[PDB]
Design an enzyme around this catalytic site. Structure first.
Site, short mmCIF file in Angstrom:
data_model
loop_
_atom_site.label_atom_id
_atom_site.label_comp_id
_atom_site.label_asym_id
_atom_site.label_seq_id
_atom_site.Cartn_x
_atom_site.Cartn_y
_atom_site.Cartn_z
N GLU B 20 0.85 -1.17 0.00
CA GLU B 20 0.00 0.00 0.00
C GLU B 20 0.91 1.25 0.00
O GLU B 20 1.82 1.36 0.83
CB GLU B 20 -0.91 -0.02 1.24
CG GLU B 20 -1.99 1.06 1.25
CD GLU B 20 -1.42 2.48 1.22
OE1 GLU B 20 -0.42 2.73 1.94
OE2 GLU B 20 -1.95 3.36 0.45
N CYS B 67 -5.43 4.85 6.11
CA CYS B 67 -5.23 3.66 5.33
C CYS B 67 -6.50 2.90 5.08
O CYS B 67 -7.27 2.64 6.01
CB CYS B 67 -4.21 2.74 6.02
SG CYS B 67 -3.74 1.31 5.04
N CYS B 70 -5.42 -1.42 5.86
CA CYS B 70 -5.64 -1.71 7.26
C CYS B 70 -6.77 -0.79 7.71
O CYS B 70 -6.64 0.02 8.63
CB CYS B 70 -4.38 -1.55 8.11
SG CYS B 70 -3.70 0.11 8.18
N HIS B 74 -7.18 2.24 12.58
CA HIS B 74 -6.98 3.62 13.04
C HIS B 74 -8.22 4.20 13.71
O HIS B 74 -8.09 4.99 14.66
CB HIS B 74 -6.52 4.52 11.92
CG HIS B 74 -5.14 4.23 11.43
ND1 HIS B 74 -4.01 4.65 12.10
CD2 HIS B 74 -4.70 3.57 10.34
CE1 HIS B 74 -2.94 4.27 11.43
NE2 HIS B 74 -3.33 3.60 10.36
N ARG B 471 -0.08 -5.10 10.89
CA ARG B 471 1.34 -4.85 10.63
C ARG B 471 2.16 -4.54 11.88
O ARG B 471 3.39 -4.44 11.81
CB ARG B 471 1.53 -3.76 9.57
CG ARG B 471 0.97 -4.20 8.24
CD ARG B 471 0.76 -3.09 7.23
NE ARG B 471 0.31 -3.71 6.00
CZ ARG B 471 -0.94 -4.13 5.79
NH1 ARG B 471 -1.88 -3.92 6.72
NH2 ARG B 471 -1.25 -4.76 4.67
N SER B 494 4.13 0.65 10.24
CA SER B 494 5.03 0.81 9.10
C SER B 494 6.03 1.93 9.37
O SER B 494 7.13 1.90 8.80
CB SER B 494 4.27 1.02 7.78
OG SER B 494 3.69 -0.23 7.37
N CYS B 538 2.99 -0.48 4.51
CA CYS B 538 1.85 0.40 4.28
C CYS B 538 2.34 1.83 4.44
O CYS B 538 2.52 2.32 5.56
CB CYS B 538 0.81 0.05 5.33
SG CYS B 538 -0.80 0.58 4.87
N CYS B 541 -0.12 4.56 5.81
CA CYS B 541 -0.05 4.36 7.26
C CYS B 541 1.19 4.99 7.87
O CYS B 541 1.09 5.75 8.83
CB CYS B 541 -0.04 2.87 7.58
SG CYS B 541 -1.63 2.21 8.03
N1 FCO Z 1 -1.66 -2.87 9.71
C1 FCO Z 1 -1.63 -1.76 9.41
FE1 FCO Z 1 -1.55 0.07 8.89
C2 FCO Z 1 0.33 0.03 8.96
N2 FCO Z 1 1.48 0.02 9.03
C3 FCO Z 1 -1.71 0.45 10.57
O1 FCO Z 1 -1.85 0.69 11.67
NI NI Z 2 -2.30 0.36 6.44
#
Ligand code: FCO
Ligand code: NI
Ligand code: SF4
Ligand code: SF4
Ligand code: F3S
Ligand SMILES: [Mg+2]
Lengths: 262, 544
Positions: B20, B67, B70, B74, B471, B494, B538, B541
């Site tokens: 991503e 994101c 995912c 969040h 992640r 990430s 990601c 992210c």
């Molecule tokens: N899994 C995911 Fe997105 C990332 N890095 C988040 O939190």
């Molecule tokens: Ni993500």
């Protein structure tokens, strides 16, 4: 073997929620769509090639003899000559501009590409813009954050087989965005009877009263959510939560505070 | 032996596909091995800046848009973060619903990652055209449980479908693939490529069901809409029929995990055993997930069924407690104004300042999160090691099953192969717990349907929301003032894994994992992608 129409898909200032939405299609499923109906010739999220090989795949598609349709996901960051959003060392605005110039058609998937979206919300540090806003070209907008795959695949298929569908003033196909969310809401009778939940923990919320007082933007939002649902099973108001107005331009600034009425 | 060229020079891979977001990787190669590396995030949006002065209740709706892959996580971290700042303890049913939706997210996220993002680094799709379907069927029968999708008929149909596709000349997403025409770093026999491809296509349908399951409780996917300050809004998600349907969909997904994902993962890992010695790091952090008590961040850390902890220098004998006061972010090698180094997220600063491409002193939009001066790997591998070290029964069983299948010691998991295996390991464990978690909520919701608690907005406060997203360790940090957001900072998995160097010039986990990567063909550096993809990057992210 019949030639499949070439589609180039660009990712700009986005969260990839729109790509993810697109692959939730069941009519047809994504595999059937890209094996039988279209030729998805560039899509960073799923393509095998990377780096220079991926960049050559894009250049190949843009130079294809039969032309191509362009799908754009994400807004365009314009500050600093577009350098806060780059792919292969080029500003996103520059690449989207070239790709758009020769496209047979342009579809903006999501509120971000259509209208600027979340990165455009105040104070807009990257100076993000919608595709139409930044390039000065008419686009078919499939907004929502993200839009229903039914709306996107419906539009893509319509564009390849029947031509440009009828669009409203916000460039949205009337097929999908012709009716207010509120007009098809199963809670409409509660709204008409002034039966509102005053809070999420209230007995009114438990009985499924209207969410207007909790900020529901259904009455000013054009989308087909209660009619088609998401993932064949649900939509936010059915899940007890007000509509945010996510298919409306600049909703991040026009529909907030989300839990209050305008 | 592992194929390796004699190439000496730079390699840049931009864009990194099948992740991503927008990532550029630069490496220096000497005699066919990577000797130095830079992880360069190429997009900035600025959610933290955008949130300033807004209503704290609105935070989750903006941050969810960090994101769409995912999705949900969040919104969850923000809700926990605000719940903590207003000092509200969510009802049991809300904890259960929130954790189930997270579980559903793990299932969807890991499945899609392995098949649609990662697999193409190890599986040569075009080689599947060379396979004999009958021999492929016979193979699938010995290496995985029996299923109609693995019959010679089903495998031949896939092959024919793929053949018609390749013969058309419109290769679509396979255009210029690194495996076209063969590649030394691709080890699999054609029969296994056919099996993996068939499952690749099945997984495209299966992910739809995994998203439907999640939407039953979350309202929709992507971008759920069921969480509120004080709990959840989804009363219907506590009732009998939706929970029966949720369970049915989840069991379908878990069957695919156990019949296809795990066996494919193990089959692949079996051919690429050399990758158990490539791409290792030393430090692991997890905040834990699936807590039985989410009344506060301290309770979350202590009661997570996937435990929290910190491992340093690969020492599985010393799992420390997470010190939230020891987290900080550096910006020395990032595109932010110099002088923002060493900031704890409650005091975080986000002041973007771009320089130029491949400026080795400032080369990324990600900050560099550090823990007491150290770079930390987060994610499935971190969680797996931490749980394994603490003797968590499910992890102990599933790890030892994997180590036995592969005939390798646990130290082999400190690698790109281990990182990929760990992702499957925890998917299997999530699957094993779904029925129990669902039943707990079904029974609880039937008896009392309280889903949201009463609360009040303070004039001034702070709070932190923790989650272990697919992640890894995720945290949202809020400062409230005059009943508005005064500061809001995201520190995302990430960011930990793929951020640039810290203030000491110390490499991030991915940068360090890349050192020693053999490059068989500098024109087609699949090995760089293998290691980078194993972290499941990601960038939307990481940067937000
Ligand atoms: N899994 C995911 Fe997105 C990332 N890095 C988040 O939190
Ligand atoms: Ni993500
Ligand atoms: S419109 Fe929404 S879902 Fe789509 S890319 Fe933008 S923020 Fe993500
Ligand atoms: S819940 Fe929202 S869309 Fe539904 S009737 Fe009430 S205000 Fe209208
Ligand atoms: S929030 Fe968006 S998804 Fe439909 S219900 Fe409202 S328009
Ligand atoms: Mg941050």
């Amino acid at each position: 073997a019949k030639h499949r129409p070439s589609v180039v898909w660009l990712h700009n200032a986005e969260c990839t929620g729109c790509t993810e939405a697109a692959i939730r299609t069941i009519k047809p499923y994504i595999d059937a769509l890209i094996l039988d109906t279209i030729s998805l010739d560039y899509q960073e999220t799923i393509m095998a090639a990377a780096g220079e090989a991926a960049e050559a795949a894009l250049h190949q598609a843009l130079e294809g003899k039969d032309g191509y349709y362009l799908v754009v996901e994400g807004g365009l960051p314009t500050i600093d000559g577009g350098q806060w959003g780059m792919v292969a060392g080029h500003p996103m605005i520059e690449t989207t501009k070239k790709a758009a110039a020769k496209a047979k058609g342009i579809i903006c998937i999501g509120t971000c590409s259509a209208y600027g979206g979340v990165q455009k919300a105040k104070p807009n540090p990257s100076q993000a813009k919608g595709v139409s806003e930044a390039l000065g070209v008419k686009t078919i907008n499939i907004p929502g954050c993200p839009p229903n795959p039914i709306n996107f695949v419906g539009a893509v298929v319509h564009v390849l087989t029947k031509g440009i569908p009828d669009l409203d003033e916000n460039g949205r196909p009337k097929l999908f965005y012709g009716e207010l969310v509120h007009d098809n809401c199963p809670r409409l009778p509660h709204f008409e009877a002034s039966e509102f939940a005053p809070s999420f923990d209230s007995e009114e919320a438990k009985k499924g009263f209207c969410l207007y007082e909790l900020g529901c933007k259904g009455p000013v939002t054009y989308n087909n959510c209660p009619k088609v649902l998401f993932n064949q099973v649900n939509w936010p108001v059915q899940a007890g939560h007000p509509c945010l107005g996510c298919s409306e331009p600049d909703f991040w600034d026009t529909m907030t505070p989300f839990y209050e009425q305008g | 032996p592992t194929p390796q060229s004699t190439f000496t020079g730079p390699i840049v891979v931009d864009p990194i596909t099948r992740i991503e977001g927008h990532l550029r990787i630069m490496v220096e190669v000497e005699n066919g091995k990577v000797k130095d590396a830079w992880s360069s995030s190429q997009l900035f949006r600025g959610l933290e800046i955008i949130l300033k002065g807004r209503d704290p209740r609105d935070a989750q709706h903006f941050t969810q848009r960090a994101c769409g892959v995912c999705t949900y996580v969040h919104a969850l971290a923000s809700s926990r973060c605000v719940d903590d700042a207003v000092k509200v303890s969510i009802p049991a049913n809300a904890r259960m619903m929130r954790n189930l939706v997270m579980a559903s997210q793990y299932l969807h996220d890991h499945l899609v990652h392995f098949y649609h993002l990662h697999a193409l680094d190890w599986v040569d799709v075009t080689a599947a055209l060379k396979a004999d379907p009958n021999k492929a069927a016979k193979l699938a029968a010995s290496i995985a449980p029996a299923r109609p999708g693995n019959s010679a008929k089903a495998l031949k149909a896939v092959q024919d479908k793929l053949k018609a596709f390749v013969e058309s000349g419109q290769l679509g997403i396979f255009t210029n693939a690194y495996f076209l025409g063969g590649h030394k770093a691709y080890y699999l026999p054609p029969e296994v490529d056919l099996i993996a491809t068939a499952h690749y296509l099945e997984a495209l349908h299966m992910q739809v069901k995994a998203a439907s399951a999640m939407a039953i409780l979350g309202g929709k996917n992507p971008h759920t809409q069921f969480t509120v300050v004080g709990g959840c809004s989804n009363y219907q998600g506590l009732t009998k029929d939706p929970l029966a349907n949720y369970l049915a969909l989840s069991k379908e997904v878990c069957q695919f995990v156990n019949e296809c994902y795990i066996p494919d993962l193990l089959a692949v890992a079996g051919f690429y055993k050399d990758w158990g010695g490539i791409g290792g790091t030393s430090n692991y952090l997890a905040f834990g997930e699936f807590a039985t008590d989410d009344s506060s961040p301290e309770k979350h850390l202590a009661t997570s069924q996937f435990p929290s902890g910190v491992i340093t220098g690969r020492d599985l004998g010393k799992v420390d407690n997470v010190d939230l006061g020891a987290i900080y972010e550096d910006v020395k090698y990032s595109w932010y104004a110099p002088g923002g180094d060493g900031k704890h997220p409650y005091d975080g600063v986000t002041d973007p300042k771009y320089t130029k491409l491949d400026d080795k002193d400032h080369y990324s939009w990600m900050k560099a999160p550090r823990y007491k001066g150290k770079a930390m790997e987060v994610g499935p591998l971190a969680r797996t090691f931490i749980a394994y070290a603490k003797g968590q029964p499910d992890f102990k069983k599933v790890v030892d099953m994997v180590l036995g299948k592969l005939s390798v010691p646990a130290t082999a998991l400190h690698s790109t192969l281990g990182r990929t295996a760990a992702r499957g390991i925890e998917t299997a464990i999530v699957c094993a717990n779904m029925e129990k978690w669902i039943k707990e909520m079904a029974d609880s919701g039937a008896k009392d349907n309280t889903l949201c608690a009463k609360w009040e907005m303070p004039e001034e406060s702070k709070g932190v929301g923790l989650a272990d997203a697919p992640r890894g360790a995720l945290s949202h940090w809020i400062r409230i003032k005059g009943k508005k957001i005064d500061n809001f900072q995201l520190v995302v998995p990430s960011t930990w894994n793929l951020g640039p160097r810290g203030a000491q010039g110390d490499k991030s986990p991915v940068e360090e994992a890349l050192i020693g990567t053999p490059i068989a063909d500098p024109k087609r550096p699949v090995e760089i992608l293998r290691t980078v993809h194993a972290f499941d990057p990601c960038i939307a992210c990481g940067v937000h």
